[PDB]
Design a protein around this ligand. Sequence first.
Ligand SMILES: CC(=O)OCC[N+](C)(C)C
Length: 386
Amino acid sequence: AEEEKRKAEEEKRKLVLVIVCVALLLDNMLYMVIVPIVPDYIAVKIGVLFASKAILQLLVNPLSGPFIDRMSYDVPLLIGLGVMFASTVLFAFAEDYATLFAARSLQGLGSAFADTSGIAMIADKYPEEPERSRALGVALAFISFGSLVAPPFGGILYEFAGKRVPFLVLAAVSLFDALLLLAVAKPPVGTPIHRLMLDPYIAVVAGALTTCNIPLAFLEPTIATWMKHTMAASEWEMGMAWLPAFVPHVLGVYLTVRLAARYPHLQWLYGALGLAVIGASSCIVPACRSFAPLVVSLCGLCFGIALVDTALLPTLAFLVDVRHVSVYGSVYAIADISYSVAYALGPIVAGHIVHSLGFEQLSLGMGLANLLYAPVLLLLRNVGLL
Ligand SMILES: CC(=O)OCC[N+](C)(C)C
């Protein structure tokens, strides 16, 4: 009678959860597999390429906020996966420099239309605290799986085949996922965004996401030359250095979901612990001389970003549910802005800072920026009262 429709609605919930998580996995695969291929095909500006992706993702998101607010979620998710498919097909036969440039900018456009609406859709069909925390935890777990084990197993199959075959196969996989979303999904006025910068705790979560995401923006185009300069830097362990930093991320997301379920007041405290672990994991970086201490420092850094993201995105959706209209367009767009600011300031400025100032000084300044934004989360003792 009723339980038939309830189990059908549970299937329709879990199915779009698995589909959007696989879409996010392929998205982060496509972000992290392209970066060792563009310097092979040359013939600062490479930083102009990557920061152009991030700056186009920055410029679309306030303009795109009302598009997810004023309309539904299935249409921008379909637009996002379609633009991402077109970008991957453009990367399949990207020959000149302008081809790579336009393809990377369209990948940023697909980011702005896909990732924000996907994290909104996962946080829309769970209007309750432990299930929303579990769903966002599994979403960030697949995002971390992509961004932290996909580039080695993409580069391995890049070595002995080329690039024309596997990018077309992976774009066909992404279009297969988009057609499955079309086959099963079957396709109020919200709160504006120009007031949300004057909304203070939204701004606190935005600054915390930016300071959380700043080490992976200022270390991924940076640590590679620091392998050759100081470290022994074997190729198996230079290419696969980010592979062991996956299991602490899943351990951190399980700890954060478990401490968010058993405790409704310890989101922000373990989030400040996450910022503290990010700051300490940035400060350890000069002291490492051999390989495995650097590995465990990167593992601590990914543990910290897992804690911070899983403790603050349900807090962000909770704050939208408390104070404003229950829509999820512009506020995860503020979250994506908080990603794009760090990933825009990263690749251009990091190499010039290291070549001018030094790498130990940059790492200490980054750790001090983390640990001095750590007393900004003192204010979040007044959220669970609401
Ligand atoms: C590459 C990217 O989209 O940044 C978010 C991934 N994360 C949460 C692991 C840093």
